[PDB]
C-alpha cells in the first residue's frame, strides 16, 4: 500500500511495502517510454495509498509525489546499510556518488559530468555486440586487460573498434572495459571524501567483474544490496510511507 516508482533511462522499477513492513518489487525495461512502463508496472497492483515517483520519467508520469533519485537512493540504501556513509549508483545514463548521515539524509552528492554520460548503456551495448559468454572469473584472471580510454563512450567505442580490428582478444577488451570503468568509478567515488566503506548499487553493480575490479581499486570494503536495481525505488516507497 506504499509504492515507490523509479522510471529510469533504461529500466523502470516498482517497490511496494505492505503494512507488515515486507516488500515486493517489479522491474521492466523503460523502452524510452517511462509513462507506459510505469502504468504497466502499476496495473494489477491493487490500490496504493501513497506513491512516490523518481527517475527520468518522474514528471511525465504526473502521479504521486515527485522526489529525485538522489534522495530516494539515499533513503533506500540507508534501510539496508545504515552504517555506511557513501553510495555509488551506476545506472544506464548517470553515475551518482552520495554521502549520507546517520539518519539517512543526503549531506552531499555529485553526478557525472556531461562527457561521462551513458557509461552503463554503452557497457550493455558493447557486451551484446562483442559477445560476452565467458565467465567473470575469466575477466579477473585476464593478465592482458587492455587499458581503454576513460574519457567517454565515444572515444572508448573508437578504441574497441581499433582493438578488435587488429585481432585483440575479446576477453582482453572486455576485461579492459570493466577495469577502466572501475578505475574511473573509484576516483569518482572519492569525490565527497575518501570512504572507509562503500555501497555500490544500481544495475551497474550487477556486473560481477566490475564489483571486484572496483573493490580492488578502492582498497576498502564494498557492499552491494541484495537487489541493486530496486534500492532507489525502495527509498521512494519508504518516503511514500513516512509521508
Amino acid at each position: 500500500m506504499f509504492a515507490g516508482l523509479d522510471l529510469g533511462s533504461t529500466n523502470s522499477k516498482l517497490v511496494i511495502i505492505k503494512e507488515d513492513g515486507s516488500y515486493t518489487f517489479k522491474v521492466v525495461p523503460t523502452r524510452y517510454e517511462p509513462v507506459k512502463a510505469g502504468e504497466l508496472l502499476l496495473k494489477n497492483t491493487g490500490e496504493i495509498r501513497n506513491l512516490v515517483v523518481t527517475g527520468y520519467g518522474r514528471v511525465a508520469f504526473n502521479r504521486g509525489k515527485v522526489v529525485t533519485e538522489i534522495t530516494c537512493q539515499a533513503r533506500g540504501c540507508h534501510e539496508l546499510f545504515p552504517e555506511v556513509d557513501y553510495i555509488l549508483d551506476l545506472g544506464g545514463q548517470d553515475a551518482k556518488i552520495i554521502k549520507k548521515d546517520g539518519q539517512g539524509r543526503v549531506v552531499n552528492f555529485l553526478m557525472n559530468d556531461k562527457c561521462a554520460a551513458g557509461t552503463g548503456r554503452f557497457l550493455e551495448i558493447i557486451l551484446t555486440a562483442i559477445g560476452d559468454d565467458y565467465r567473470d572469473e575469466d575477466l579477473i584472471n585476464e593478465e592482458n586487460a587492455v587499458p581503454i580510454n576513460s574519457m567517454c563512450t565515444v572515444f572508448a567505442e573508437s578504441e574497441v573498434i581499433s582493438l578488435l580490428a587488429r585481432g585483440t582478444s575479446k576477453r582482453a577488451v572486455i576485461a579492459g572495459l570493466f577495469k577502466t570503468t572501475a578505475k574511473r568509478l573509484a576516483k569518482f567515488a572519492e569525490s565527497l571524501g575518501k570512504p572507509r566503506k562503500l555501497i555500490f548499487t544500481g544495475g551497474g553493480a550487477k556486473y560481477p567483474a566490475l564489483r571486484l575490479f572496483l573493490q580492488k581499486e578502492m582498497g576498502v570494503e564494498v557492499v552491494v544490496p541484495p537487489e541493486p536495481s530496486v534500492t532507489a525505488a525502495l527509498g521512494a516507497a519508504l518516503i511514500a510511507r513516512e509521508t
Binding site: 527520468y56 522526489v67 529525485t68 533519485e69 538522489i70 534522495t71 548517470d94 543526503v106 549531506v107 552531499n108 552528492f109 555529485l110 553526478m111 559530468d113 556531461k114 554520460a117
Partner: protein, 421 residues
C-alpha cells in the same frame, strides 16, 4: 520594414536572421511574459527584447552617420568610460546562441567555449545587426580561446587587442595602466576626439551611473521574500551591455523604486521558504537563460550572480580625479579590481563569493561554467573545496547553448534544492 531596410543596409543575411529570430518570441513568452508577479517596470526591458534588433541598432547607425564610431567588446575590462567620453558607443557582443555555433566551428575548434564559437558565427553568418554596425572589435588577452580567436576575427572586422596581465602585483598594475593609455590614444585616433578633463569626467560619470543603478538593484535582492526573480535581473544585466547608458540607468532606477515598494510591504515573488541561490562562474550572455529558468522553475530563487553579467560588471566604480592622467589611472584601477579567473591566484573572487553568501542570505551556491571554459572550470575545484570547509552547500554545473539537456540539469538542481531545504 524600417528594421528590414536597416538590416539590408547593414548587409545582414536576411533569411538566416529571420530563421534565428523565429523561435525567440515564444521562448520569451514562456520564460518571461507569462510568468506571474513580475514588476511593472519590467515593461521597458520586455519592450527592448521585443525589438532587440530595431530601436537600439537604429540609434547606433545614426551615431555613425554623424561621424561617431561603434566599438564592440567581449570583456568587462575594456574601458567603456574612454569610448563614451568621445561620444562614440560601446556594445558588448558575447555570444549566447546555439544557432551560430556551427558557423563559428568553420574556423574554430568544436572543443571550444560556446560563447566564443557563437560570437564568431554571428559575424561569419552576418546574423547580428549589432555586429554588422560595429566599426571595431576591442579584444583582450584573457582566456586562450578568445586570445587566439581574435587573430581569426581580424579577417572580418578590425580587432584591437588589449594586453591584460595575468597577476595583480605592482609591475602588473603599471603594465595595465600603460595598456589603458595606449588604448586611449587608439580611441582618440579612430574618433578624432581628443580626451580632456571635461569629456572624460563625463564619460566616467555616465558609466558610473549605469553601474550604480545595477548595484542598487543587486542590493535590493538581499530582502526576503525576494522582491524579484533572478531571471529578470539576469536579463537586465544582459541588456546593460548594449542599451543606451543614460536611458538604461533611468529605467533600472525606476525598477528599483518599485522594488522598494514591494519590500516595504513584505511582498515577494516566492514563498520565503524557497531556497535562495547564488550563481557563480562564467557570464550568461543573452539569450542563455537556461540555468536561471530551471532553478526558478524548480521553486528556487536566484538572488545574485557572481559573474561578469552580474556582480563582477557593476560592483566597482571609477574614483574621481582632477586631470586626464589621473582619470586614466583610475579607470585602469577600476577594471583591475574585477576578480576574473584568468588572473592567478584569484583569491579575491572567493572573498566576494563568501561575502555575497552572507549579505544575500544564500542557502546554496551553484557554480555554473560553460563547457570547455578552462579558467573557471579549473578554478571550480578550489572554490568548491573552500565552500566545503565553510559548510556552504555547493553544486558544480556545466553546459552549452543546446537546450535539451534540461532533464540532466533538472535532476542535479532539484536534488540540490531537496538537500538544502
Amino acid at each position: 520594414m524600417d528594421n528590414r531596410e536597416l538590416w539590408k543596409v547593414l548587409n545582414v543575411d536576411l533569411e538566416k536572421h529571420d530563421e534565428f529570430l523565429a523561435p525567440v518570441p515564444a521562448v520569451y513568452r514562456e520564460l518571461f511574459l507569462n510568468r506571474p508577479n513580475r514588476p511593472r517596470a519590467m515593461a521597458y526591458f520586455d519592450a527592448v527584447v521585443g525589438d532587440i534588433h530595431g530601436i537600439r541598432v537604429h540609434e547606433l547607425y545614426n551615431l555613425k552617420q554623424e561621424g561617431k564610431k561603434v566599438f564592440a567588446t567581449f570583456c568587462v575590462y575594456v574601458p567603456e568610460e574612454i569610448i563614451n567620453a568621445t561620444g562614440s558607443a560601446c556594445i558588448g557582443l558575447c555570444g549566447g546562441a546555439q544557432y551560430t555555433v556551427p558557423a563559428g566551428e568553420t574556423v574554430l575548434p568544436r572543443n571550444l567555449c560556446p560563447l566564443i564559437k557563437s560570437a564568431m558565427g554571428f559575424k561569419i553568418e552576418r546574423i547580428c545587426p549589432y555586429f554588422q554596425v560595429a566599426d571595431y572589435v576591442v579584444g583582450e588577452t584573457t582566456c586562450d580561446g578568445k586570445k587566439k580567436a581574435w587573430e581569426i576575427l581580424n579577417e572580418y572586422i578590425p580587432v584591437y587587442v588589449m594586453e591584460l596581465p595575468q597577476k595583480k602585483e605592482e609591475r602588473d598594475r603599471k603594465f595595465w595602466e600603460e595598456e589603458i593609455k595606449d588604448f586611449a590614444q587608439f580611441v582618440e585616433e579612430k574618433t578624432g576626439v581628443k580626451l580632456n578633463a571635461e569629456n572624460l569626467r563625463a564619460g566616467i560619470e555616465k558609466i558610473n551611473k549605469k553601474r550604480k543603478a545595477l548595484k542598487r538593484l543587486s542590493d535590493l535582492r538581499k530582502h526576503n521574500p525576494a522582491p524579484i526573480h533572478g531571471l529578470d535581473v539576469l536579463l537586465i544585466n544582459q541588456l546593460a551591455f548594449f542599451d543606451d547608458p543614460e536611458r538604461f540607468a533611468t529605467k533600472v532606477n525606476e525598477l528599483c523604486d518599485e522594488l522598494e515598494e514591494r519590500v516595504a510591504k513584505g511582498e515577494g515573488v516566492v514563498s520565503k521558504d524557497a531556497p535562495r541561490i547564488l550563481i557563480t562562474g562564467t557570464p550568461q550572455p543573452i539569450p542563455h537563460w537556461k540555468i536561471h529558468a530551471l532553478i526558478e522553475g524548480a521553486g528556487g530563487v536566484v538572488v545574485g550572480e557572481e559573474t561578469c553579467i552580474g556582480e563582477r560588471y557593476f560592483k566597482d566604480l571609477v574614483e574621481p580625479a582632477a586631470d586626464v592622467e589621473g582619470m586614466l589611472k583610475n579607470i585602469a584601477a577600476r577594471s583591475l579590481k574585477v576578480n576574473c579567473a584568468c588572473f592567478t591566484p584569484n583569491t579575491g573572487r572567493l572573498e566576494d563569493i563568501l561575502s555575497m553568501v552572507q549579505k544575500l542570505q544564500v542557502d546554496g551556491v551553484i557554480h555554473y561554467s560553460l563547457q570547455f571554459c578552462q579558467p573557471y572550470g579549473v578554478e571550480s575545484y578550489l572554490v568548491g573545496r573552500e565552500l566545503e570547509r565553510r559548510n556552504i552547500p555547493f553544486l558544480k554545473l556545466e553546459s552549452d547553448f543546446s537546450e535539451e539537456d534540461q532533464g540532466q540539469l533538472k535532476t542535479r538542481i532539484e536534488a540540490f534544492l531537496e538537500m538544502i531545504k
